[PDB]
Amino acid sequence: SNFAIILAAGKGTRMKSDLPKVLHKVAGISMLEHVFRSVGAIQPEKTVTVVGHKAELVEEVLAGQTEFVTQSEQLGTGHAVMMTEPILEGLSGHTLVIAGDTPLITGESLKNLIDFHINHKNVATILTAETDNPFGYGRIVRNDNAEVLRIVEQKDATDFEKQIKEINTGTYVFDNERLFEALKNINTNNAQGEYYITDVIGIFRETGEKVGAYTLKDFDESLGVNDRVALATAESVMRRRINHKHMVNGVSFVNPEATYIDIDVEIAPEVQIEANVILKGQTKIGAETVLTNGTYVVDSTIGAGAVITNSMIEESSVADGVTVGPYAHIRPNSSLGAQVHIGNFVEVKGSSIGENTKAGHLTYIGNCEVGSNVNFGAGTITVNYDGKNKYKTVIGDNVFVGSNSTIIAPVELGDNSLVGAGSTITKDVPADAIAIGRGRQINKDEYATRLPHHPKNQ
Amino acid sequence: SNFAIILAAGKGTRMKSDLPKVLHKVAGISMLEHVFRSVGAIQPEKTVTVVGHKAELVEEVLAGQTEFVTQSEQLGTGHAVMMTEPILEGLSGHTLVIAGDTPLITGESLKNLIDFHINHKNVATILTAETDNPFGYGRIVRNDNAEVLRIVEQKDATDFEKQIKEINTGTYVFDNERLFEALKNINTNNAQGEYYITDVIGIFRETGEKVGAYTLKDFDESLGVNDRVALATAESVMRRRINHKHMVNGVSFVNPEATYIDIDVEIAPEVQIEANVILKGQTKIGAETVLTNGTYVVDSTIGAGAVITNSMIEESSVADGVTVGPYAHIRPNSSLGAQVHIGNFVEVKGSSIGENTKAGHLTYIGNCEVGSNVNFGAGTITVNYDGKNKYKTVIGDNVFVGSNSTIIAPVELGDNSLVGAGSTITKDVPADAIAIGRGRQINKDEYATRLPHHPKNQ
């Protein structure tokens, strides 16, 4: 009943990239993927994506729910659609034709397109829009009774026709039956090589079959991306849309025009986001937590009541009430327990940290299983690499790891123990003990008067 | 002679917050507080704020110069004003009626509103504005001679009336006498429960008493905040206004559209601010200092000629010529003396630092009284916590604190002394002495050929 054809073979030369045009990301996912999301809104019985060069790459990535045909030669949009013939020829119903480079179009607009089509039982329906600078776009010609007669390109347009402000977005709905029919009719009697999807509209004009146009109230929603300038504009519209949705859902933004949140990030209500925060991938933020300017989060989970201050968190888990930063880096596979505190210049990598534990400064915790109520003094380092292998360090509950100490794994610091500040630990420390591995202080009276820094020597 | 009534009881359901709508901040202070600031511009003999739910909270915070009446039930704006009757009934004069959720209105606009009122000796004056999308707003109906006849809501508006572009901002000036009179007249003969402030305009129409409207030249100044989307817009307008004011006052902004400066921050002329800088609360910046992208300052004082590079400064004092950052954190109750230098990855907490002293890297200084011309080598740590209590460290003038040393308080390093790099200091170091607490170096020939990192073993 409903079928979809997505054109993704284009030659994105103005992109100046080796990556197939439609694979370029917009807020987390590729333009193609956004098109797949709006397309799904019309519940197409079949979905066929036409890819061109590097065809393998596009497929090798998003093998999403969609058939895949290849267009080895650049013979135009008509030929691209013709490549879906083997799969859609014969079937009766409505077929959506959309480009993979117009990611701003919405599922809602696509639904209205079909409804508008089936409604007037048109043979073909053109998704159109209006602008005051239609230069370059095919124009939409209608009769005094406002019926879509045909589409006129800029090069063929009469002076009088250049005045038309309604343009063709390049998105269409065709009755699948007539469509492939008209595609062979143009292909064979073409007296030329390349044919275009708009050539089918020319045929319906020759035969008088009903063709209509649904207009998009927002012209900017029809943007076709051809270069990194339109790319940025796409990014900008999608950003406003994502952020508008969160604000309506109860999230505060100091500046939603400069906050970068990917398409799939989930944010509980009452969260507060300062300007210039970055949320990427599969990220979740719980209720009332606070994200300050600079925070950067990727594929992570943050609980409720947390305060993330200018810090970078990657593939990690952060419980409720956790405070992080400023300038902290939480690396892959880390888990911070409830009320944990990670202060400035602290790095946590592949480590579980129990609740209420704190590492407030200039610290590195890697490959450690850390307990609850632990204390890391400023300067502490967990050494877990010898140039070939990594080793694990186990730290019990309530351990007091003295400042500037060097913990050389594999070792265990038992519960309630303490490592003297400035110590190098090479062996296990039993529970309730203290470990000290540092030289004893020695004073040399008057010796400083004999060194470069002394006032007497400058 | 002049009285003010501020409506702050509203049910901000679209805000999706537990915090009373008007308490949500906009550039440092709550919307209510901005309204109190514009209201003060008309020197009201009395100011009464009507609060609703959580009434205690709004009051418990800004017990600012203003009477407080409570509206326990949601019976409309008319009933809310009726709650101020005990306090304003009888008094003669002009009474301003304003919402606590329209924080962009200015004191200047409010003054022009009253003057326009007293001028034409109107009984009531409507603060209006113009827009091309008046859908939803009450319209302002005037006669062929441009006199305000009445206000018409959207639901009652005739097709012909929907065309009116002048809308009601919900701000008004009433002759206090007639106002409460008309409020009882509607209340009793209401034949309904809730009555609205606009019902009083209906009565003056019935009686023919003169009603006028002062139009705001800037429509965006009338924004009523109902959700976090308008919240963000408020933040955006107020930000442009604050920043415009500083630029006119001689401050350079690389991008004033993305620089966040609270309402009360003071900035001397010739200061240079890069994009994405944050100034909050009671912050002061002296002449010619430079703030680079990322700098974040809260309730602090910075002198003239300073250079703050991507650093966070909180509740502290920073003298003239000080250089901080990149990535430095100056925490509560710190004071940096003239020409002091705090470099990358350095934390200073509750400490006074004398002039020309330097801590250029990976350093923590907490609870210290530090002298002038001191030098902290990279890696230094002042240890001031044992898990229960904090201790103080006193460091004289010209001390050279060697890199990677660990200073365990409570201790004193006397003038011109030096602590050997990599030392753990547990006792006082007399003036002019040197202290060393580190193991002596030992070399083991060929031993490395026997370890994982060696080329021979990989």
Add this chain to the structure above:
Amino acid sequence: SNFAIILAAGKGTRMKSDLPKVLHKVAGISMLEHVFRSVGAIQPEKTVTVVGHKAELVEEVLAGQTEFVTQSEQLGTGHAVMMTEPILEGLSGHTLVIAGDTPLITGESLKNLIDFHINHKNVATILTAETDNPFGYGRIVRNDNAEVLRIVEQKDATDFEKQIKEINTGTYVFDNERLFEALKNINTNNAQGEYYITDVIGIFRETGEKVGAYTLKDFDESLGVNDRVALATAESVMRRRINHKHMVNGVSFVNPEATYIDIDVEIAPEVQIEANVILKGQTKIGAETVLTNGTYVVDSTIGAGAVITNSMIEESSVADGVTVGPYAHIRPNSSLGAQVHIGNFVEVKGSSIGENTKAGHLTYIGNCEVGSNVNFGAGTITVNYDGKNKYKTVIGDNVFVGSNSTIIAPVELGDNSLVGAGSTITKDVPADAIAIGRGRQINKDEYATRLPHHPKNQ
């Protein structure tokens, strides 16, 4: 044949700066310098800049290709041009008159101005533009046949004339001969002190000599900067222009409206720039490298395939495939070899680092010649200062510098050697050896039950 006169003596009082108005920067260089760049587009046989106060300063800086005359008194634009008389009087040809405070005008617009001039063989040509708020600007009066009759200031304009939307940008092309002629004719018979460049247009009106106006299609291109508000606007237009140019050239921007790239930065295609990145001065970025939010680069070279994560790089060289950050600081005169890795909280100053070497954390490397495949454990510090002099450290290939070690220069760590974590190195370490300078660990059973942090004591 073509001559240029740049007016740079103005009294930029609304700037509130001690620095001559035209010296204020816009995207890396001064407004004056941007004007010199557009001016060069018309290949002027001679270029003369009129400077006023602090005349020495403007010259003492950009002694660029241009004659320099001084205007000691503020007698108007006419007098300023009159100061170029000694140098341009007599010569025949077209003379461009432009202000040093209109930096957005383009060389292309300037070329079109001259062509439009020489074309109609006009005596004088006025560079004009159109806007809907011409209040304050001199208006352009034309006859029913659209010929430039004269310029009318706002104060003299008739009501009917205030309607004119075409305004004078203050940029002109005059036939050098008549120009100085008309300048003496006004100067002597002036019956007043100060004369203005627009007075020459008045004379051509008296004599009927042909005067024309070339209109700028973009009004915003004519901005005259007088205060830091227009300054910011200039910065904003120039930023969009620079960034538009890179996007067209194949560079991706997450938000080109909030990315700050100086006028002279070079960026290879396929580079990806996140929002809020800063590129200043002579900076070069190679193909496909990635710059994340916060990165700040000044006068540096970055190769291809690099990933710079929220880090600051100054006057340094960075090879291909290098990864830096987050929160790393690469200081002046550093060179990172191919595939080098500098992680979080690491500082590199005046040091060469060989390929594949890594310093992933909390590390300071200053004044070192470091080899290839070296490894710096977290916490390492190279000590190179004694309060008076700096010393160099030489580190061979494949050295393993243990965590928390303190390397006191001048020393050498030979190839494949290893420094034990937590060691203080005061002497050379031969190749293939290991060096250890740390106290041995000692455990005291039960001692912790006797300290403040222990659960038993709280």
